[PDB]
Structures are given as structure tokens and as C-alpha cells.
């Protein structure tokens, strides 16, 4: 079993970088007739890899679907990868590292990259909200609502 103690751990960011950029505007020439903020639909995937020993390379995938009315406006997908040299963590701690924390570092860069390609496609402004992967990860390990059943009784 996981017979490791002492909350020390260590990693250093070796490299942050975009691995993939995508922007498909299929209706673009015609859809510009509709001057409006196209309805945003978010997608998020997270991958990792082993380059060398203690050297793990996490890939954050963000995909943004958008449409003016009932027809597509734009489709902008970015994959912000990152090399991190991790040690000390294991079990729940390593699942928190590569499954939440490592994507959460890459997230601002993935955001600016999406907005760049939307700007290049001459579509309205796109700013994605900060998703705290680490907080929602803690809730994932239980898959249930928070327990704080009390009786203040203010009347």
C-alpha cells in the first residue's frame, strides 16, 4: 500500500507550451450577418505522459463550441501542454497533482490562445471563467453534496 508520509513534495515547471491550436469557422462568411455574442458551450479533457523518469507532461484540452441562433458561429479548441518534474506525491496526492493542479497552471495560457483564434476569426469577445480543478477534484472523490446539516433557526 501507500506507505509514504511527510507532506513535503516537489516539482518544478520545466516548460509550459501549446501543443495544439484549432479554430474552425464553417458558417463564418454568412454567420457574420448576426451581430451577437454566439452561445458558448464548454468542453474540458486532461491527459498526461511519461517523457523521462519523474518527468511527466500534462496536456490540458479546452474546446469551445459557439453558434449564432441555431447555426454554428465558430469552434475554437486549444491544447495547452506542460512538462512538470514531480516527486513526493502518491495515491490521492498524485491524482490531485496531474489530475487537477498541473492543468490549473496551464489554464490562463489555454484561455488567451482560444481568445486569440476567436479574434483572428473576427468573432465577439471570449473570456472563460477560472475553473478551480483542485476544489471540484476533492468533491469528485466522494461524488456527493457537502454535509453541513445545522439548525440556526432565525425567525
Amino acid at each position: 500500500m501507500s506507505e509514504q508520509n511527510n507532506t513535503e513534495m516537489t516539482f518544478q515547471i520545466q516548460r509550459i507550451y501549446t501543443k495544439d491550436i484549432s479554430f474552425e469557422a464553417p458558417n463564418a462568411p454568412h454567420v457574420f450577418q448576426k451581430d451577437w455574442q454566439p452561445e458558448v458551450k464548454l468542453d474540458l479533457d486532461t491527459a498526461s505522459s511519461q517523457l523521462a523518469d519523474d518527468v511527466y507532461e500534462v496536456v490540458l484540452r479546452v474546446t469551445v463550441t459557439a453558434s449564432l441562433g441555431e447555426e454554428t458561429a465558430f469552434l475554437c479548441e486549444v491544447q495547452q501542454g506542460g512538462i512538470f518534474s514531480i516527486a513526493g506525491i502518491e495515491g490521492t496526492q498524485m491524482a490531485h497533482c496531474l489530475g487537477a493542479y498541473c492543468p490549473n497552471i496551464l489554464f490562463p495560457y489555454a484561455r488567451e490562445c482560444i481568445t486569440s483564434m476567436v479574434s483572428r476569426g473576427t468573432f465577439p469577445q471570449l473570456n472563460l471563467a477560472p475553473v478551480n480543478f483542485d476544489a471540484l477534484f476533492m468533491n469528485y472523490l466522494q461524488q456527493q453534496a457537502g454535509e453541513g446539516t445545522e439548525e440556526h433557526q432565525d425567525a
Binding site: 455574442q37 458558448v40 519523474d54 502518491e90 498524485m94 496531474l98 489530475g99 471563467a129 480543478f133 477534484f137
Partner: peptide, 22 residues
Amino acid sequence: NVVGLTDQTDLFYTMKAALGLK
């Protein structure tokens, strides 16, 4: 090598809101 995840393709991101398209 020291660790290894299932490689969560399916995430857990939930939000009762949107971007706020004004």
C-alpha cells in the same frame, strides 16, 4: 513510474452559470 493516473478523459467541472454573454 513512481506514480500513474487512469488519465481522466472525463472531468468533473460543474458550474450553475455561463460566460455572461452581454
